[PDB]
Design a protein around this ligand. Structure first.
Ligand SMILES: *[C@@H]1O[C@H](CO)[C@@H](O)[C@H](O)[C@H]1NC(C)=O
Ligand SMILES: *[C@@H]1O[C@H](CO)[C@@H](O)[C@H](O)[C@H]1NC(C)=O
Ligand SMILES: *[C@@H]1O[C@H](CO)[C@@H](O)[C@H](O)[C@H]1NC(C)=O
Ligand SMILES: *[C@@H]1O[C@H](CO)[C@@H](O)[C@H](O)[C@H]1NC(C)=O
Ligand SMILES: *[C@@H]1O[C@H](CO)[C@@H](O)[C@H](O)[C@H]1NC(C)=O
Ligand SMILES: *[C@@H]1O[C@H](CO)[C@@H](O)[C@H](O)[C@H]1NC(C)=O
Ligand SMILES: *[C@@H]1O[C@H](CO)[C@@H](O)[C@H](O)[C@H]1NC(C)=O
Ligand SMILES: *[C@@H]1O[C@H](CO)[C@@H](O)[C@H](O)[C@H]1NC(C)=O
Ligand SMILES: *[C@@H]1O[C@H](CO)[C@@H](O)[C@H](O)[C@H]1NC(C)=O
Ligand SMILES: *[C@@H]1O[C@H](CO)[C@@H](O)[C@H](O)[C@H]1NC(C)=O
Lengths: 211, 114, 318
């Protein structure tokens, strides 16, 4: 709200459409002031001064020019319309994929990891407010592809192995939340001889003290 | 020799100073003079610094009002050497919730000409 | 517009004024196209917050990126592949060419930053701060992204790196041996050249006049009969220019759509791993790498393709 209230250029994308259409119409009207080789741009001047054999020649010149001016206008409107249509098609897609759902498409619904979006109406257009999750305050950790325990190679089920310099933990990938490495948050595959960079650490079995 | 003449300006709501670009020519043929690949730029001070592009001139050269008009090679952004290693990982300990705006045209004024 | 139609003839220039704003409209239309061309490039390549660099020591667990990374021994600082791509792909009548805002060096620099970001930090630099991760671990993440367990990557790391390195080498060999490979970019160059040459050749047209040469008319005839002959050349030359501009606007729209698609692929294939089928190559998408090319972009898509299937008996439940 504060940004829009303090930035005159914020809505240039919509203003340009208004301006381009206004400049096309004003250009078209101004062409009515053109002689196109005729004695006068004013059709009534021709009709009031000359009789039919010489007026028709002067009128033909105005018709030729005015027809050409209108054909130019319409062609430009068709090209401009096609561009607007594509913009509308994109807006409709964003409404479906950003507003009516959560998108995994990168940078389709704002910068960062998309959470949700809200539409707002605007003159001849739509404004989307994209809400994203942006990671912050990162820290450096030592990592490993796998943990070696009892001759078995262990991999994270849902996260990544990290060391704080002395102790190994497993954490979810996008948010630091270290947990003790156990049989419940890892899985086993093969022996420790194959994986490059495997490290030695204890893997805790929660049932061990129970039985 | 012939070509376009372009006037570079800040808004008149900021300054009445301008610079002139003589497109496609040498500075020696024109009659703060800088020869760009876009042509001869007169009225702007060339500097060896780099900034984000303000008013584009061409071929990597941009101009801005800094008071006087200056010309410079545009910066593409700040450098960042990522601390890569075969056993180092960076993990976020926090996050921010961000809201950004996207504006799209949907329709034109519906005109008709008789 | 004026120079094309009239050259330096004041007599023609004065006649051209009776037609109103047509020349202003045409100049405006071509200016709009030129601006869009710089916008197109920026939308595709300038998708990075910072200029990232790879580490001095290229140890990525067996994965070799030397063919896509910049070769510092060359002044252009292009990769081996980019250097190959670049090798493979009027004025006197008021027709001019304006330089791009971004130079080829600048485009290569953007491409390098995108590659460096991907190699050192995966998809994180496209969402926030660039977060480092070992490349093999990044690849393990991408295996999970296609429904393959991470131990499959780690247990076959040597094989996978070898298959990758060979596949990249084939790209270089393929381009080096296929003249038609870059037709999509060459066609754009050709179509634009054929439009400009056609426009210039129309200056040789009489359009019903005694001569195509405006000076011949002015030197031989006096004002009452010259104006008729000049009007014929103006009518034809104006029509020729209007045809040119209309075609450029239509062609520009097609290029814009292509640029829009390229920008989407940069975001969804390079700055992330896509689940969209056949959007980032054939097979299950792992990752992609951009390379710059004359007036375009080349994407190298890396995919996982299942092999050596066997028949088993199955059941819905036990
Ligand atoms: C990570 O460590 C490197 C040194 O290896 C240092 O330059 C970088 O700033 C550290 N990053 C963080 C988030 O602490
Ligand atoms: C690592 O975490 C453990 C358990 O919280 C703690 O006792 C230890 O001091 C930490 N090591 C370092 C270097 O912070
Ligand atoms: C990581 O690199 C160091 C050298 O800097 C090497 O000694 C070590 O064995 C490597 N470890 C892995 C898993 O690549
Ligand atoms: C991990 O433990 C095994 C079994 O004691 C030992 O043979 C191996 O050398 C250890 N690895 C390292 C890096 O210490
Ligand atoms: C023009 O300048 C005034 C200050 O003198 C400023 O308040 C106003 O916002 C400016 N207008 C624009 C469009 O920048
Ligand atoms: C005109 O500029 C070019 C560089 O763009 C230079 O090589 C040439 O010598 C200049 N001509 C004169 C007369 O200075
Ligand atoms: C810019 O640097 C060049 C040398 O590369 C030097 O000759 C020139 O005087 C410098 N100009 C300014 C304004 O610093
Ligand atoms: C996360 O950042 C916010 C500020 O944006 C701060 O107030 C909060 O305490 C931080 N949370 C943690 C756990 O550091
Ligand atoms: C990467 O590949 C190139 C080309 O085959 C080779 O010359 C280079 O030595 C390789 N680099 C490493 C570190 O193996
Ligand atoms: C699967 O079995 C069919 C016969 O039922 C055979 O034709 C087919 O080739 C076998 N496919 C594979 C991969 O062995």
């Amino acid at each position: 709200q504060d940004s829009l209230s303090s930035t005159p250029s914020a809505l240039g994308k919509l203003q340009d459409v208004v301006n381009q259409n206004a400049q096309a119409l004003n250009t078209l009207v101004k062409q009515l002031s053109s002689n196109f080789g005729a004695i006068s741009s004013v059709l009534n001047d021709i009709l009031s001064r000359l009789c039919p054999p010489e007026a028709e020649v002067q009128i033909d010149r105005l018709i030729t020019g005015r027809l050409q001016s209108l054909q130019t206008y319409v062609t430009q409107q068709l090209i401009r319309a096609a561009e607007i249509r594509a913009s509308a098609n994109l807006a409709a897609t964003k409404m479906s994929e950003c507003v009516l759902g959560q998108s995994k498409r990168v940078d389709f619904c704002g910068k960062g990891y998309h959470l949700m979006s809200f539409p707002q109406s605007a003159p001849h257009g739509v404004v989307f407010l994209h809400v994203t999750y942006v990671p912050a305050h990162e820290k450096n950790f030592t990592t490993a592809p796998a943990i070696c325990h009892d001759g078995k190679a262990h991999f994270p089920r849902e996260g990544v192995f990290v060391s704080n310099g002395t102790h190994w933990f497993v954490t979810q990938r996008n948010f630091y939340e270290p947990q003790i490495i156990t049989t419940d948050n890892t899985f086993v595959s093969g022996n420790c001889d194959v994986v490059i960079g495997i490290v030695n650490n204890t893997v805790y079995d929660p049932l061990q003290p129970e039985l | 020799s012939f070509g376009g003449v372009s006037v570079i300006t800040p808004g008149t709501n900021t300054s009445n100073q301008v610079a002139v670009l003589y497109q496609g020519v040498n500075c020696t043929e024109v009659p703060n003079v800088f020869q760009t690949r876009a042509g001869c730029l007169i009225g702007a001070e060339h500097v060896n610094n780099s900034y984000e592009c303000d008013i584009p001139i061409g071929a990597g050269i941009c101009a801005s009002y800094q008071q006087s008009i200056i010309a410079y090679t545009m910066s593409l952004g700040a450098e960042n050497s990522v601390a890569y290693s075969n056993n180092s990982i960076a993990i976020p300990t926090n996050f921010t919730i961000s809201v950004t705006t996207e504006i799209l045209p949907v329709s034109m004024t519906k005109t008709s000409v008789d | 517009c004026t120079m094309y139609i009239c050259g330096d003839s004041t007599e023609c220039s004065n006649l051209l004024l009776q037609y109103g704003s047509f020349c202003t409209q045409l100049n405006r239309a071509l200016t709009g196209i030129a601006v869009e061309q710089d916008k197109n490039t920026q939308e595709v390549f300038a998708q990075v917050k910072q200029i990232y660099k790879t580490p001095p020591i290229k140890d990525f667990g067996g994965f070799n990126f030397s063919q896509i990374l910049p070769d510092p021994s060359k002044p252009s600082k292009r990769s081996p592949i980019e250097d190959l791509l670049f090798n493979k792909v009027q004025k006197f009548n008021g027709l001019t060419v304006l330089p791009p805002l971004l130079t080829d060096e600048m485009i290569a620099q953007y491409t390098s930053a995108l590659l460096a970001g991907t190699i050192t930090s995966g998809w994180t630099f496209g969402a926030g701060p660039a977060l480092q991760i070992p490349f093999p671990m990044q690849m393990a993440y991408r295996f999970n992204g296609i429904g393959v367990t991470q131990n499959v990557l780690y247990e076959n790391q040597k094989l996978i790196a070898n298959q990758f390195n060979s596949a990249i080498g084939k790209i270089q060999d393929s381009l080096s041996s296929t003249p038609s490979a870059l037709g999509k970019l060459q066609d754009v160059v050709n179509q634009n050249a054929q439009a400009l040459n056609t426009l210039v050749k129309q200056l040789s047209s009489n359009f019903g006049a005694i001569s195509s040469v405006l000076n011949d008319i002015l030197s031989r005839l006096c004002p009452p009969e010259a104006e008729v002959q000049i009007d014929r050349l103006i009518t034809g030359r104006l029509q020729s220019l209007q045809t040119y501009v209309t075609q450029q606007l239509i062609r520009a729209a097609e290029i814009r759509a292509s640029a829009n698609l390229a920008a989407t692929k940069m975001s969804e294939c390079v700055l992330g791993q896509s689940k969209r089928v056949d959007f980032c190559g054939k097979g299950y998408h792992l990752m992609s790498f951009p390379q710059s090319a004359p007036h375009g972009v080349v994407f190298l898509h890396v995919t996982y393709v299942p092999a050596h299937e066997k028949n088993f008996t199955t059941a819905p439940a036990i």
